[PDB]
Design a protein around this ligand. Structure first.
Ligand SMILES: Cc1cc2nc3c(=O)[nH]c(=O)nc-3n(C[C@H](O)[C@H](O)[C@H](O)COP(=O)(O)OP(=O)(O)OC[C@H]3O[C@@H](n4cnc5c(N)ncnc54)[C@H](O)[C@@H]3O)c2cc1C
Ligand SMILES: Cc1cc2nc3c(=O)[nH]c(=O)nc-3n(C[C@H](O)[C@H](O)[C@H](O)COP(=O)(O)OP(=O)(O)OC[C@H]3O[C@@H](n4cnc5c(N)ncnc54)[C@H](O)[C@@H]3O)c2cc1C
Lengths: 519, 518
């Protein structure tokens, strides 16, 4: 009879650490004692975080915190989609879409559900019409209502509060992390120690015995949670688990970022993240209240830091000599194993990929969900660890593949960077998914375990691949056997056009809804 | 490019007419379908047991209500599989032997396992078992059905209201004939009586046409091989290898018959029986006024004569004059189910002994996957590869689940039961076993796609593994951190006892309900 875990030590007091403290503190409910160790570091600008809808259903709902409670205290805005700008046209980094085929070079990846027609996704009917010359409309404007209401900065909620589409949040992570520190220490009994790790002692099995801090205090536990960020103080340094670099799939490894004040009264608030193609990378725009966070993700093999700073500042009309800037060089990939012995990594200590599809916080609460599901006893059954590690590696490798496809299938050839992306190879499993796409199949066609497995599904692949201009070889074969379905789909498209018109005319602006929600 | 215009189905058994009906339905006059069927020596109706999605995934798709096909097929209701004598030594008998004060049986019902606080009742049951708070079997503690199956209760009240999930028992010959009439008369499928003599392949290795013994030549875009164990197209013409999987499953033979039965005097059992024998196991599939039964055995351990004797003696039949069907079968699957323009469906594709009622399921599941991956004339190869991968894991997962029935039996009393323990579990099965032993819920269960992927789930592994006596090493670790859930689960078990008691007292017998339906 081994006995349950009694003591957990979390090392790192950032977003990941305080998410871990809250999630573990809640699911356990007094069963175990949890201490979080946090070192005084130089703080960084609030450059922003873009999220996904299950931040509420999988994380805050689990904590018992309603969306209104946390959202107002963290000054969050609403995210209805990612808007991809200038991924298809040559040129310099600008916040302004270039002209492509008589219109602006952008396309949306919304959180909205893709309608099915006779059990087949509307995407397949759209391409059948495109292939047969019956349409020339872009996928996203043909198949989603959101694009035209996003073009007008509409709110996803009516003033009375009713929701007309799926949405997520834009916020400064520091504010959520402080909110969660207060919640975990004041309501869940997590003990906070402010101290710097100086020495990690391991036992004869190579497990962590204790952590000693710079003041000389010694902390032992049954389970150690590494939330120390890119340093990987426990997983990489103490435990010596290798990090698997994956820059043979993703060339971006650096960023320069700031926060820019914004006149919401004059310009309203954009209900979407922007991902703006640059000469050697892409730049995010995460709108918040009276400001937006922004960052240029670039590849040090194709632009110097000075070049990146110039390109970044010129596009927002900022003074390089006086704008406060954060610079970082990050590692791209994941640990060979996320959980080794009695040490589980959570957050960027575990894995990292550029924030092109808003996965950073998702990786934390998805791993925390998996960690509770595979929670060990004192026997630490190796199968629990093995299964956990396999969930993490497919969570990460699927996202890595999806993100590479954003660059691999961009039509641009105008800089060494954009050409270089096309000389990398896709992973075998991603090449299979592309083949499936081109054969007319619906990838992972549509509860958190289902969202976890089907994160990147047919909707996501059409949004990005057809947005960029990769489409199937021929119409999906079943459609030629469904003459009634293909003749009646006219009314489904027209239904989308109706909702576009009616929402455009009746929806308040996001600015108007956000003012009401605050004052 | 271009759609498929013509389809030839070779074989007119259960799988052939299932394929003719399903494809004919789905294509709706956008393809001409022909089925080639040769006359074969008829066999006895030894019975076929099924799963609930026969209706939801197959007959519903055809637009055929449950009442409609049941009445033409003389079908009865199946609520579970009842496993008899898998844990005690002795001869092959229809009577359960003595084990810890009760009958040596356990059930695998279709009904749903309750959850408590997001954790399956199985884990709470074992926690109590492990802490000495209970000694009740898993199925009686966690399912309402065992108690009412013991009393041969109906799954539907006389007013028709359904109280539990159920499937069907029937004679496959009658379903095949029903479907042949439906496909030819309602769906324009063309039936041709003839025997395949030659298959012409082109230089790409695809089938061009088949020539019959009357000299007729049938050409098509897509060929469906429903020829049974013979694999006339997929194995003989396309030369695709067959993967023998007798290193996981020793049974390769069966002897079967049909037994008249006085339903008015004895009632009708609302379950399939799986009765362990000295060298295999025997099915009992109740139908109306008769039951089908067969001894599945391993020729490595019993001659056909011994198997005939053991089987006839258990039913008190005359080995010398009882009408019997004898079969030898290949256990396994093709290396690839679909090669070129040739798709195999049915036993031409794969076969495993019917210990968990999958034979008809393999057909309509494969047909669902075929329509999902349906080609155009370019036969894009990823469609074929993805189809083949779905079939391969469908089968190998069933094969593993079935091997566990023999691998984890406690019996050691005959060379057969001992030899089973000397075989090796596939790596993927051993990982599932490891997971089960660590208290995890394998494929935790809740649309056929959710059903196809999670066919064998935590409910199924506990029914069989906990039934045979394999249980986890220790309670699921999460439970020690959920003291409120483990203290309140008392009333979830209590609720099961209440349904057991209430349904027992108010449900008609299966017989009584069946009488009324006619
Ligand atoms: C440029 C960039 C852009 C991003 N954009 C997004 C986005 O749009 N949307 C999204 O969801 N996510 C985004 N993310 C991800 C976000 O950063 C992560 O989700 C989150 O930060 C998880 O990692 P972390 O908390 O571990 O990192 P950190 O915030 O760095 O936490 C590091 C912790 O390590 C502790 N530590 C280190 N060493 C010691 C020591 N000796 N002793 C004690 N403590 C120590 C420190 O106390 C510190 O608290 C982005 C990340 C980066 C880098
Ligand atoms: C012992 C046994 C027990 C079973 N128990 C169950 C159960 O409990 N529950 C369940 O759901 N399923 C069960 N099944 C499954 C069900 O019976 C099979 O799934 C079904 O037979 C599908 O395979 P098949 O139809 O292709 O084979 P068959 O039924 O043998 O059909 C063979 C066909 O091949 C055709 N053919 C062959 N050669 C030619 C030729 N030259 N020219 C023209 N036609 C040709 C013939 O027309 C013939 O009809 C069982 C099967 C067996 C053998």
């Amino acid at each position: 009879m081994s006995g349950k875990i009694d003591k957990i030590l979390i090392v790192g007091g950032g977003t990941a650490g305080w998410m871990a403290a809250s999630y573990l503190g809640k699911a356990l409910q007094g069963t175990a004692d949890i201490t979080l160790l946090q070192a005084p570091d130089i703080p960084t600008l609030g450059v922003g975080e873009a999220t996904m809808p299950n931040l509420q259903t999988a994380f805050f709902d689990f904590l018992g915190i309603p969306e209104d409670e946390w959202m107002r205290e963290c000054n969050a805005s609403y995210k209805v989609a990612i808007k991809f700008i200038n991924w298809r046209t040559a040129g310099e980094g600008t916040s302004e879409a270039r002209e492509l085929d008589g219109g602006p070079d952008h396309f949306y990846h919304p959180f909205g559900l893709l309608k099915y027609h006779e059990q087949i996704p509307l995407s397949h009917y759209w391409f059948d019409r495109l292939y047969r010359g019956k349409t020339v409309e872009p996928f996203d404007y043909a198949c989603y209502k959101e694009p035209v209401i996003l073009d007008a900065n509409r709110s996803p909620r009516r003033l009375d509060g009713s929701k007309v589409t799926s949405y997520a949040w834009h916020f400064d992570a520091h504010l959520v992390a402080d909110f969660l520190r207060r919640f975990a220490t004041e309501k869940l009994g997590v003990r906070h120690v402010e101290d710097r790790v100086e020495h990690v002692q391991r036992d004869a099995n190579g497990n962590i015995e204790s952590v000693r801090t710079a003041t000389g205090r010694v902390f032992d536990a049954d389970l150690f949670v590494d939330c120390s960020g890119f340093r990987g103080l426990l997983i990489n340094k103490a435990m010596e688990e290798p990090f698997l670099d994956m820059s043979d799939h993703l060339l971006n490894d650096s960023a320069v970022a700031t926060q820019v004040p914004h006149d919401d009264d004059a310009n309203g608030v954009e209900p979407f993240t922007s991902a703006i193609a640059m000469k050697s990378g892409w730049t995010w725009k995460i709108p918040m209240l009276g400001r937006f966070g922004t960052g240029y993700v670039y590849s040090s093999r194709f632009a110097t830091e000075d070049e990146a700073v110039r390109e970044f500042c010129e596009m927002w009309h900022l003074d390089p000599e006086t704008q406060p800037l954060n610079r970082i060089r990050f590692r791209v990939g994941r640990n060979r194993r996320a959980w080794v012995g009695n040490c589980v990594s959570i957050g960027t200590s575990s894995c990292f990929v550029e924030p092109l599809e808003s996965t950073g916080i998702y990786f934390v609460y998805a791993a925390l969900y998996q960690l509770v599901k595979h929670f060990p006893d004192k026997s630490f059954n190796p199968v629990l660890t093995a299964r956990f590690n396999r969930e993490i590696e497919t969570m990460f490798d699927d996202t890595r593949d999806f993100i590479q496809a954003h660059f691999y299938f961009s039509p641009r050839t105008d800089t060494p960077f954009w050409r270089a992306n096309k000389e990398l190879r896709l992973a075998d499993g991603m090449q299979e998914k592309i083949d499936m796409y081109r054969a007319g199949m619906a990838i992972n066609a549509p509860n958190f375990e289902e969202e976890f497995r089907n994160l990147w599904n047919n909707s996501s692949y059409y949004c990005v691949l057809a947005g960029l201009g990769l489409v199937p070889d021929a119409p999906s074969p079943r459609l030629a056997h469904m003459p009634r379905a293909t003749e009646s789909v006219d009314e489904v498209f027209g239904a989308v056009k109706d909702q576009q018109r009616n929402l455009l005319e009746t929806l308040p602006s996001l600015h108007e809804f956000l003012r009401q929600q605050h004052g």
